[PDB]
Amino acid sequence: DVLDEQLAGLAKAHPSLTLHQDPVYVTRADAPVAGKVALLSGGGSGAEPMHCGYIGQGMLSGACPGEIFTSPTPDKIFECAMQVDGGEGVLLIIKNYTGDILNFETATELLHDSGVKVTTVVIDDDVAVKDSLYTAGRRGVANTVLIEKLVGAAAERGDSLDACAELGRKLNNQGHSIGIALGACTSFTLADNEMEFGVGIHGEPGIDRRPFSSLDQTVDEMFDTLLVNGSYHRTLRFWDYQQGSWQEEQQTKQPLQSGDRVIALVNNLGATPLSELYGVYNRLTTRCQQAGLTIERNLIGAYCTSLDMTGFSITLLKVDDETLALWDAPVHTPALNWGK
Amino acid sequence: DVLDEQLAGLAKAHPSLTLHQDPVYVTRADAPVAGKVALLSGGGSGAEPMHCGYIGQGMLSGACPGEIFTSPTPDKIFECAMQVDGGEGVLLIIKNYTGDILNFETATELLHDSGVKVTTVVIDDDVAVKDSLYTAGRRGVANTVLIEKLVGAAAERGDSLDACAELGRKLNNQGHSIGIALGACTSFTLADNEMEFGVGIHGEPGIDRRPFSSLDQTVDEMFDTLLVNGSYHRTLRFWDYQQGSWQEEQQTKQPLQSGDRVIALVNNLGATPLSELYGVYNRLTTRCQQAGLTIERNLIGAYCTSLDMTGFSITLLKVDDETLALWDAPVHTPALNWGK
DSSP states (O other): OHHHHHHHHHHHHOTTEEEETTTTEEEETTOSOTTSOEEEEEEEESSTTTTGGGBSBTSBSEEEEEEESSOOOHHHHHHHHHHHOOSSOEEEEEESOHHHHHHHHHHHHHHHHTTOOEEEEEEOOBOSOBSOTTOSSBOOOTHHHHHHHHHHHHHHHTOOHHHHHHHHHHHHTTEEEEEEEEEOOOOOOOOTTEEEETOOTTSOOOSEEEEOOOHHHHHHHHHHHHHHSOOEEEEEEEEETTTTEEEEEEEEEOOOOTTOEEEEEEEEOBSOOHHHHHHHHHHHHHHHHHTTOEEEEEEEEOSSOOTTBEEEEEEEEEEOHHHHHHHHSOEESSSOEEOO | OHHHHHHHHHHHHOTTEEEETTTTEEEETTOSOTTSOEEEEEEEESSTTTTGGGBSBTSBSEEEEEEESSOOOHHHHHHHHHHHOOSSOEEEEEESOHHHHHHHHHHHHHHHHTTOOEEEEEEOOBOSOSSOTTOSSSOOOTHHHHHHHHHHHHHHHTOOHHHHHHHHHHHHTTEEEEEEEEEOOOOOOOOTTEEEETOOTTOOOOSEEEEOOOHHHHHHHHHHHHHHTOOEEEEEEEEETTTTEEEEEEEEEOOOOTTOEEEEEEEEOBSSOHHHHHHHHHHHHHHHHHTTOEEEEEEEEOSSOOTTBEEEEEEEEEEOHHHHHHHHSOEESSSOEEOO
């Protein structure tokens, strides 16, 4: 009943969104939008604004909320995708959790079989831990927001389903994140001035627990771990819609290196005061330019949360002129709004 | 030390702001912007984004940070006002805390005598407690944000200093806020399932400590306290720049009533998950509808915080067409961005 209330709250607060019933999901009020790729994500609740605050022109067309920390059921995904299809196909953005993977996979298959053109981008940006509690491979965290914006802008510009998917997949190969917690959400137990280093957004254990000395020293280790765990080879599944089947591809991520230009996301995991995030960003810019990385754009705030956890995360995403044009492109959503 | 880092972070993150040193304050990078009334506010740190996140076109022209919870010293106010003066005068927005009142009055007299056209608006929107720890009368809280926007928009459009001031004062007479905390920032202590009802943003005590049954019941009593404490007469002091002196004015607030149209702000005091804020909004609209108030616009999120305090606040502001037009007018700040 508390979930239903919050979703009703969202719908009342934002008449540009529509709340659907049996099954529950959220779409742009003007969806389906003819002639553009439709973007769709979803996942466990308690990560707000992700994903419902990202619905709107230049970003998502809809989102499927699940229960707390559990994935949306595939009926929601299926029904949501058919709602938003504008005749150019639907692109499904899936964070790398086993539940999300099972469910989005189920929906995708049925979707293709019902005449909907569809494919998928898997997000696996968290550098900290391979094979966490609810993941095979690497967890999907705050980089989803950056990709949702950039592919959102591509789709909105009129790019095709394949071009948006290739962009999404390429970006997933160049974004890196890590997060820390000084105290669990309401799940696990820390000593005083101890942190969980490399924490998940569902409260999953990190690399270890270790002492907290200062804000600056933490950002340093976080930044160092981004470079140290930067390199990664793994297999990802994508729907091939021409063959109508799952196509395993092998991909490699290169670590960030001297000369790279980046978008930086300093993300409140729930209970970190904004003032502290700006301190984080002060230290992050210093490290970046010592490492020859230019931060071209930033987001600082609460974008990918883990209920009311005390902690924060850093995300660095390699970009170029084309990607910045997509960054600077208009976006009109509850959580992100700029441009005409 | 930590404060300097946060402010440097702010400055690096927003090239449209300028961080001044000796003394410390923040202005729009293009200040002074000639030919518009300049808006200036300030106060203790730990209310982020209030006020530095509100510096920008259509809102504040600069802001003065103090130490944590303590007011900024008059040198910062005086230099900041001088920096932002575009020759139409400066309007100083002052939340009602004895430190703020004192420091801003000092700076004001001195500004007048140095050739700057200047006047003041006092915010006293917190309905819960008369004569708190650091206040004579009622505390100034989240309604400041709505007034900064609406008065910001009037300045941007080209309205005279007097007109902006009158608008400010009138809005101050029509806005109502109340807050609650389920846990203190890091100052005071609650048993489990207990709340501080009518808390200040500096952790001043509320009306009392009382049981937290459920989220809906809390909003109900908050909304009821907006109506019960709605009525309020008191004396406020304003700078009269034509006579060059302080001018006392008795003013009275009507409570909200059936037929009123309002802007609603549901504000995270720092550690309340956004999902819970939408639940609050849901209950608030139901209660408003029953009382025959129409909510015409809303803001939901962290706009006036008290570091990492666990709670939220509700602010309702009585509006009409002219005011809604000012609401819809463009705003371009770190914290609020919309329009062309």
